[PDB]
Homo-oligomer: A and B are copies of this chain.
Amino acid sequence: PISAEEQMIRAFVKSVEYMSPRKIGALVAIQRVRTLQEYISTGIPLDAKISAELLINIFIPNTPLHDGAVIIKEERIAVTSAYLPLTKNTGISKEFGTRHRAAIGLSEVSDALTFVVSEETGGISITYNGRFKHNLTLDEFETELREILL
């Protein structure tokens, strides 16, 4: 049978695939070892199975769920719309936006793996232990996900 990890990467890739061409902003954070329970409390509880369809429906613009961070924990969507800390690092530049600052911000204080789809460019991004790899391609973003959740 397919692994809960494996299914979850498949879910992520398919939704980014859908979302990136359409410049649909997305912000998804996966808890790893450091508990994200503080940011989980700020969001709308779903406790839902992870599917590409749900993620695409969550981030459709001008819906109740779309702004803020989806937070994955134990291979479920714990919450949507959660608030992550915005980075105070000035070198963050433009082109990147709140979603990116929230992703960068969370990687400063946690081991979480976060990824972003830019609302204005559609550009895929990813943060992990301070490091911030942006403008990935679908194959790039996919291979990155696999290593971290090997």
Contacts and interface: CB of A to CB of B under 8 A. Distances in A.
Contact of A63 (B45, B56, B80): B56
A49 B47 contact: yes
B56 A57 contact: no
Contacts of A54: 44, 46, 48, 65
A145 interface: no
B49 A57 contact: no
Chain copies in complex: 2
A66 B53 CA distance: 10
A51 interface: yes
Interface string A37-67: 0000000111111011110111010011110
Contact of A64 (B44, B53, B80): B53
Given A57-B57, A63-B56, A44 B48 contact: no
A47 to B, nearest CB: 5
